[PDB]
Design a protein around this ligand. Sequence first.
Ligand SMILES: C[C@@]1(Cc2cn([C@H]3C[C@H](O)[C@@H](CO)O3)c(=O)[nH]c2=O)CN([C@H]2C[C@H](O)[C@@H](CO)O2)C(=O)NC1=O
Ligand SMILES: C[Se@@+](CC[C@H](N)C(=O)O)C[C@H]1O[C@@H](n2cnc3c(N)ncnc32)[C@H](O)[C@@H]1O
Ligand code: SF4
Length: 340
Amino acid sequence: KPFVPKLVYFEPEALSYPLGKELYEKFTQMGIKIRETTSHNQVRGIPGETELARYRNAKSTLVVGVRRTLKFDSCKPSAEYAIPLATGCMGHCHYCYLQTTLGSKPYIRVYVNLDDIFAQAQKYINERAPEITRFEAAATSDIVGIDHLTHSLKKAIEFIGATDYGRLRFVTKYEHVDHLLDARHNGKTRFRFSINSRYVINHFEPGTSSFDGRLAAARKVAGAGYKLGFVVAPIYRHEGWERGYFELFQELARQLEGMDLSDLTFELIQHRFTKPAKRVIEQRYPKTRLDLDETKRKYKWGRYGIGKYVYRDEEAKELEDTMRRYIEQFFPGAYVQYFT
Ligand SMILES: C[C@@]1(Cc2cn([C@H]3C[C@H](O)[C@@H](CO)O3)c(=O)[nH]c2=O)CN([C@H]2C[C@H](O)[C@@H](CO)O2)C(=O)NC1=O
Ligand SMILES: C[Se@@+](CC[C@H](N)C(=O)O)C[C@H]1O[C@@H](n2cnc3c(N)ncnc32)[C@H](O)[C@@H]1O
Ligand code: SF4
């Protein structure tokens, strides 16, 4: 608060780039322990004796590296592509889906070759133009949370602003957004914040900024002319969820009083987990009250990836309809982009 790692690895190749040169100067000056790693894909010697210890310590470790895979993943329903600037998070959200996506790489990775990345993104925009091409910057990380250390997203925001047909979006649980307020976004960045019921935030979201912290930060960026949006995720059927999520939109609208919310968007994601995740979360978060009972769920078989448990179609529709009614009640004119 804000995130500063207690251990930093550098790829040798990273030091050949401006941002790699800058971060090495910054972190050595701060007196942080710094190491070499032959690849950010395989970093050795993270302290701990149990897997759980190394997990906690990885989430305090930064790895400055080079993006060698320049081909972008698709990132639907959010965006055509995920622009890869970072991988990993300092948060300890019990439900986090990165526990399966980056289960083996729980440290924070930032890539230094922004010229390569922005170039390739420009290629993708050219491939589809004059159609709009969206890029998700926070698909596998809390890019905003860590950006104060690198300013990589700020640069990504300004690059996209310079393009005609390119668009950027990202979502965060962190309030540390002041350095992004004077960025030349040119209306092409959707700045989003993850929100939830009080039950879910308090019980399942340690290491993140409080609901009020996210809303203060939300007011600032809307005040800076960014496009604003929220991601209600994970939508979770805890005891009194109906009332729990009613008071969310009630408090949300209250904290966004007297503001231009004509271009406000909402995205809705029901809670989901994989079969591995149930045993991964049980040890990584022992005393969590997060229900991972598959008998309350339906298994949605995978296509290219592995399948996952979601709520039954009927219970899923109850959630969607409830969130839609609440958004329509407190935020008339706002647009629900999707429910998943
Ligand atoms: C912030 C996200 C980013 C995102 C991630 N992902 C992938 C990458 C990540 O590793 C994986 C997690 O299962 O989900 C995706 O396919 N589409 C996305 O839009 C988060 N998600 C999640 C929800 C679900 O896990 C998956 C598919 O919708 O993406 C989403 O739908 N909307 C977003 O805006
Ligand atoms: C991995 Se999050 C990356 C962006 C940023 N660090 C952030 O937290 O907002 C992407 C979103 O998806 C949700 N989410 C995370 N895990 C799950 C999940 N298992 N099921 C259902 N949803 C899950 C989180 O609440 C986020 O709103
Ligand atoms: S913040 Fe977004 S990413 Fe970091 S843990 Fe909570 S969910 Fe996973």
